[PDB]
Amino acid sequence: ATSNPAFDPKNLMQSEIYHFAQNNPLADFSSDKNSILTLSDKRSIMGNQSLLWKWKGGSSFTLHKKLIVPTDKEASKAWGRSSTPVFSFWLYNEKPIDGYLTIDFGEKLISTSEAQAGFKVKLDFTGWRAVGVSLNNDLENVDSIRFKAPSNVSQGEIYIDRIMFSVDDARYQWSDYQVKTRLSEPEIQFHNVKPQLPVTPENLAAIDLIRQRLINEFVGGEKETNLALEENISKLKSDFDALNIHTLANGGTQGRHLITDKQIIIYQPENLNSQDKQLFDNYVILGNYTTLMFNISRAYVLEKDPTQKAQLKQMYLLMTKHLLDQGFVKGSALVTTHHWGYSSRWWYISTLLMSDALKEANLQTQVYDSLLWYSREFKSSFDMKVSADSSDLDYFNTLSRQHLALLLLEPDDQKRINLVNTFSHYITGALTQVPPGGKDGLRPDGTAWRHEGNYPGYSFPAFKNASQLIYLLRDTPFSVGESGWNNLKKAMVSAWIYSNPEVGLPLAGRHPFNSPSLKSVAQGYYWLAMSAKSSPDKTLASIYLAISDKTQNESTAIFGETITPASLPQGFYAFNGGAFGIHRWQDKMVTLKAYNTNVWSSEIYNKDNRYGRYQSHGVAQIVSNGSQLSQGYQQEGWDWNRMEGATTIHLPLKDLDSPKPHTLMQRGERGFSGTSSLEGQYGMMAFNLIYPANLERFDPNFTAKKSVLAADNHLIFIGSNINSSDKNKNVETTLFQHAITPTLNTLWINGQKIENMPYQTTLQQGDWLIDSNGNGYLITQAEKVNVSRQHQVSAENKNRQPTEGNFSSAWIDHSTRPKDASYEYMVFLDATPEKMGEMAQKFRENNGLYQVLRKDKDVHIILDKLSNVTGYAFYQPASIEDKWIKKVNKPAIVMTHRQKDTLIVSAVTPDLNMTRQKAATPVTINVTINGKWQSADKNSEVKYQVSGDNTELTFTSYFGIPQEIKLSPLP
């Protein structure tokens, strides 16, 4: 504390703290009214001493301190976010008091004064509590702060420490059992499903087995993310001693004060005076503390030496006693505990391991009640009523096992069984339902959403823990419903398909060049495989082996059965939940990605993905199995304009940077864009590139139509109707871009090996290249293709700091055609100089590779002569002239393959037919085909009707999921 008023203009943000570790400690204090004020050193919050206040009923002491209390506006201006001046302190009762403390604020207050405003603190409790109120908002209708003991209590005794005037976040003074504020987080009210399971030996055993299975996971290796594991006992003893915790003879502890990472905000640490900051730095951060608690519990469970095991128990129990005495108990807000999980997640888990110890020490009820109370922050999930928001992917990551741990700690058997039964139902619903609109959760095409779109960086950690939850509960009366198992399998098989083993650049969300990897989800495949109704699920088992690099020989001891590791999946898979598709051939995967009204192009934050504008610009990133960095996808020097496959305007980075300083998730201008599939082997992307009417830095007249047809070892790319405001100046389509290294050092051009750096040349129709990753590019329609091996300067995506690197790249320059520019080229995924010569020759023979049957604003039609498949991107409903397709009445992607005796036709719209609020509903598409056909089976849901000379097909497109039918000719 200082001589200046609280909230003083030299530093309004500098807190005034009465911590008594300075001279004239009680100078500003006058006991007066029937009170005696002493300092004690057996107990304290900040420093080593606290104020001991002995009193008789209705008596008072006074803090003499001028306050120039700022308005919420003044406070908020001073800090930079919505704020309020707050008065706070800590108090300790050694026994409960049947009355209220009255704290009053006024001018020259003595006991006879009435004067102004104040508040009430209920004293019916024991141990430390914190009190914190907004001076502007929390008082019942200044240089005097008067603390008045209860009028209706004969006598008593209170300890008080760390009296503080500070500027605080206006959201975070919470009500509790001692003080009422304007803010309240309501307590959990558990849902309960009927009928109830009975307490029986079987049901009780199953509960205890679930607890044991959880213990197993947390002690038996498997590295948890965001757990600072420490197994060396000596280190644990060392950190524990440094806590300086001692039991006090008559109840309570003394030791270092515990504070959460969010609680510290009330002090305004960075603005504390030096005397205060030094005393504040001897606080212990709760997160580190509960991590220590967990690490000790794990060590205790594993400890072979009975003496060492008993030491570990004692350390844990004492940590527990200190924690509760510090005021982390039921009904104690501690002013706030928001983001509670970051400070306590491993406390919940530690109680599983220490369940028996807590019981014998008679601490289980107190710990349960405390954890339950602080969990009220998570009431929307912890209540366990299934709602539109229950499929929250972050919950599965950060809270789901903690929620289960809490339930298992409930003391009553019948209630514990009710809770875990309800939890089983909650998880089954969460993993089964299709959330409406853009709400989190799994989707019917296998995508999995957070931040309102498919997002691997969030889904991957959720798949790991949701699979683990199902495995924890397996083969008991609490097992997750098969519907939830099925939906999660669809999503995890899908993730296997769209990762290699990292997801592509187009799926990297706001972390380009730091994609999530299926390697982090590996154990989830084992857990889900082993929790099948008929375990093991061979598919998921085979995937686990592949991802974890385990052999068939190793499979028997893991799964109880010999299983061949999955080979890399082959063919084409449409995922319109992200307006993408994946083509796979041999060890390569191609991520084809568009965007539209329902799929944001990119997620860009204040400090993430700043240059991500073209992340979804009809990209087609090719990735061979293995590290993408090893393949030359290097952030340093990367030209963010030149994302592989995209048509873009090449811009200076200052212009390419998102025009919003904080968040932009730019959605497209129509519902239609994405992909479709045929026979699980062939695919087509259709991408209608349209920009907003008036978004700064976005050219409103930038347009393109871009389609890709993928089959076997090749892809055919075509583009039409390319335009901009400036006659296609700087308009480019990128064939490829990758870093140059000793292993990636060659480019083939037209049978010639190029290694020089720098190197430039220009190519045209009939020319070919092979990049260092073995992809062949044959230029089939373009006037001007630039090829460059050059030093490039760029900036990294978080803080825009300069980077550099050497790159090989090639792009089509569309500026040769001022209006409705166009391109065609073809990629071969297994290219060699030899095979490319063969392809170029085939091209020169009246184009034996493919034929473009239509290339306009309404339809793109590509016949692939290598695979004998035709793809039809109806950007608009149209009647057409064609051998197979006559008319389609909605924007759609249609595909055909005439095999020996059949015609297979697939259709979809990649338009999900939804909004951010509304559930997707099915789109009915009528596809008229030429000629008379009948159905070459009966297992297929597409409807058909001969009508005159032609056949009417009726497709139902739900969530952009393709359907197909095998047809045979009618005589």
Kindly list the catalytic residues: 451, 458
**Residue 463 C-beta: closest distance to Na ion, Å:** 49
Residue in the block written with tokens 């919950």: 395
Q: Give the separation between CA 882 and CA 884, rounded to whole angstroms.
A: 6
**Residue 120 C-beta: closest distance to Na ion, Å:** 24
**Residue 49 C-beta: closest distance to Na ion, Å:** 5
**Residue 15 C-beta: closest distance to Na ion, Å:** 14
**Residue 135 C-beta: closest distance to Na ion, Å:** 22
- 3-state secondary structure at position 624: strand
Residue 503 DSSP code: B
Q: Give the separation between CA 549 and CA 584, rounded to whole angstroms.
A: 20
Buried b (16+ CB within 10 A) or exposed e, 601-621: bbbbbeebbbbbbbbbbbbbb
Q: Is 161 annotated as a binding residue?
A: yes
Q: Give the separation between CA 425 and CA 427, rounded to whole angstroms.
A: 6
Q: Which of 19, 593 has the CB closer to Na ion?
A: 19
Q: Which of 267, 823 has the CB closer to Na ion?
A: 267
Tokens of 815: 């500026």
**Residue 442: count of CB within 10 angstroms of its CB:** 29
Q: Which of 16, 161 has the CB closer to Na ion?
A: 161
Buried b (16+ CB within 10 A) or exposed e, 680-705: ebbbbbbbbbbbeeeeeeebeebbbb
Size of the site for Na ion (CB under 5 A): 7
Q: Which of 161, 767 has the CB closer to Na ion?
A: 161
Which residue, among 803, 768, 774, has the nearest Cα to 787 in the 3D structure?
768
Cβ neighbors of 584 (< 8 A, separation 6 or more) are 497, 568, 569, 570, 571, 572, 573, 590
Residue nearest to Na ion (CB): 47
Contact between 328 and Na ion (CB under 5 A)? Answer: no
Q: Give the separation between CA 130 and CA 91, rounded to whole angstroms.
A: 7
Q: Is 311 annotated as a binding residue?
A: no
Which residue, among 870, 878, 865, has the nearest Cα to 925 in the 3D structure?
878
Q: Which of 44, 397 has the CB closer to Na ion?
A: 44
Cβ neighbors of 730 (< 8 A, separation 6 or more) are 649, 650, 651, 724, 815
Q: Which of 48, 247 has the CB closer to Na ion?
A: 48
**Residue 39 C-beta: closest distance to Na ion, Å:** 8
Segment interacting with Na ion, rule: CB under 5 A, options 88-96, 129-137, 159-167, 666-674: 159-167
Per CB under 5 A, the list member of 19, 322, 817, 897 interacting with Na ion is 19
Q: How do 284-285 and 258-259 pair as beta strands?
A: parallel
Per CB under 5 A, the list member of 12, 15, 17, 20 interacting with Na ion is 20
Q: Give the separation between CA 541 and CA 560, rounded to whole angstroms.
A: 11
**Residue 113: count of CB within 10 angstroms of its CB:** 14
Q: How do 933-935 and 923-929 pair as beta strands?
A: unpaired
Q: Is 650 annotated as a binding residue?
A: no
Q: Which of 161, 964 has the CB closer to Na ion?
A: 161
Contact between 161 and Na ion (CB under 5 A)? Answer: yes
Tokens of 108: 């020259």
Q: Which of 18, 611 has the CB closer to Na ion?
A: 18
| Number of continuous H segments (helices) and E segments (strands) in the chain | 20, 48
- Taking residues 29 to 68 in sequence order and writing x for each that binds Na ion by CB under 5 A, - otherwise, the string is ---------------x-xx-x-------------------
- Residue 413 host element (H or E): helix 413-432
Which residue, among 498, 908, 904, 500, has the nearest Cα to 685 in the 3D structure?
908
Tokens of 535: 């375990």
Tokens of 466: 């949701």
Q: Which of 31, 950 has the CB closer to Na ion?
A: 31
Q: Give the separation between CA 768 and CA 816, rounded to whole angstroms.
A: 20
Residue in the block written with tokens 């030496």: 305
Q: Is 124 annotated as a binding residue?
A: no
User: In this structure, are residues 104 and 116 in contact, taking their beta carbons and an 8 Å threshold?
Assistant: yes
Q: Give the separation between CA 752 and CA 749, rounded to whole angstroms.
A: 5
Segment interacting with Na ion, rule: CB under 5 A, options 155-163, 265-273, 511-519, 667-675: 155-163
Amino acid at 449: W
**Residue 99 C-beta: closest distance to Na ion, Å:** 25
Alpha carbon distance, N-terminus to C-terminus of the chain: 99
Contact between 644 and Na ion (CB under 5 A)? Answer: no
**Residue 48 C-beta: closest distance to Na ion, Å:** 7
Which residue, among 145, 37, 48, has the nearest Cα to 89 in the 3D structure?
145
Please provide the size of the chain in residues: 971
Residues of this chain that interact with Na ion (CB under 5 A) are 19-20, 44, 46-47, 49, 161
Residues placed in the known binding site: 19, 46, 49, 161
Residues placed in the known binding site for Na(+): 19, 46, 49, 161
